[PDB]
């Protein structure tokens, strides 16, 4: 059996998956995650996969830091690296969801004239995080630590304007009867790295 290596976390809007190396050859893996409180909990048992979805555990407390470990076990009609005793494992880097999960790509839900403005509404994407029993939207999780930044321009001139909101609503001025294009981006101002999502697809009304 070959101990697992390159344990990395893949996380977007809290959906979290631990990945690792190598594709198994005559071995299976069992993954454990611990709320840094020590007490480990196996989540993926004797699998040939090289990834394990741990969303169920991290979303119990996104601000808490998490530790994971992958155990290697002999598989199939074979010997046993040792005496069928202490399997080869490996711990993962630490992971604090709130601070490290990537911000998913936003989606503009609609455009509507309101008074002399155009109301651009961002879809409040629900996540797997749950408080009391309700699935929390990304806004619920971050509160005001999340800003949506809008970019908009007339397709003819390409002159760009930008606006920000810490709700999911924008109220902006646009020249009447002109075709505009819009793109929205998510940002967590308090972060110093990985603070920006990729831009929503350009929508030219």
């Amino acid at each position, epitope marked *: 059996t070959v101990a697992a290596y390159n344990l990395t976390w893949k996380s977007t809007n809290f959906k979290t998956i631990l990945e690792w190396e190598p594709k198994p050859v005559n071995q299976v893996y069992t993954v454990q995650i611990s709320t840094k409180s020590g007490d480990w909990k196996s989540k993926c048992f004797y699998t040939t996969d090289t990834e394990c979805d741990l969303t169920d555990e991290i979303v119990k407390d996104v601000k808490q830091t998490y530790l994971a470990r992958v155990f290697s076990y002999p598989a199939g009609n074979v010997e046993s690296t040792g005496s069928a005793g202490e399997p080869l494992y490996e711990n993962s880097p630490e992971f604090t969801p709130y601070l490290e999960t990537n911000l998913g790509q936003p989606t503009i839900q609609s455009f509507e004239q309101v008074g002399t403005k155009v109301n651009v509404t961002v879809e409040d994407e629900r996540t797997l995080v749950r408080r009391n029993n309700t699935f929390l939207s990304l806004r619920d999780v971050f509160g005001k630590d999340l800003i949506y930044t809008l970019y908009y321009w007339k397709s003819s001139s390409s002159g760009k304007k930008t606006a*920000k909101t810490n709700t999911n609503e924008f109220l902006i001025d646009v020249d009447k009867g002109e075709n505009y294009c819009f793109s929205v981006q998510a940002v967590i101002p308090s972060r110093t790295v990985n603070r920006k999502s990729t831009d929503s697809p350009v929508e030219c009304m």
Partner: antibody
Amino acid sequence: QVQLLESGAVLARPGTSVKISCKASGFNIKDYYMHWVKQRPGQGLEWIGGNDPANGHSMYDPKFQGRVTITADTSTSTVFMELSSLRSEDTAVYYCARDSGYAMDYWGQGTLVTVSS
Amino acid sequence: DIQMTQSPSSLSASVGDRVTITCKASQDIKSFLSWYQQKPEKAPKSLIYYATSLADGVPSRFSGSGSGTDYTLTISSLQPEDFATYYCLQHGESPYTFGGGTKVEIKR
């Protein structure tokens, strides 16, 4: 540690162009919005425009649109402001500033651009 | 476009005083109002953002207040290093606009 270092002072003749830069370090400029602010001798601060290096979008104040171009080079962590058809009113100190979303949290020390014949 | 009217353009104070500087926006800017301090020949420095949030390491002598169109920057227990020029900035939507500035000078 976050720092913004502006290129040196420059003298330019009326009608020509000038391109100043700002070297960022201690962070990735594609994670922020980089802006340029000018201050004429004895006057206040005035927003010129800025750029989002993650997508290339540049925004310019209507008064400068047409003769200012703001670009970024992510491989060298440098942002630039090029201003053309230079005139006297353009003589000023230009500051590079980082927009974190809620604030222009970091500023360069400013570059003096003198436009004179 | 949003206009910012900052006042007063100049104010006189003594060490220990409490002074208030105001910025009124031409429309509701939803607290995307920040304040900066600038001393002669120095670059501006962030004091307060999102109307009332004190920036990292900035003295508690600085506080901000407001929502809608009206905002204030108050400096309490005014200290010698506080005499300088102050600017508000609306940057919730471009074009971004600075107030005209307020120079806080020494009374005698």
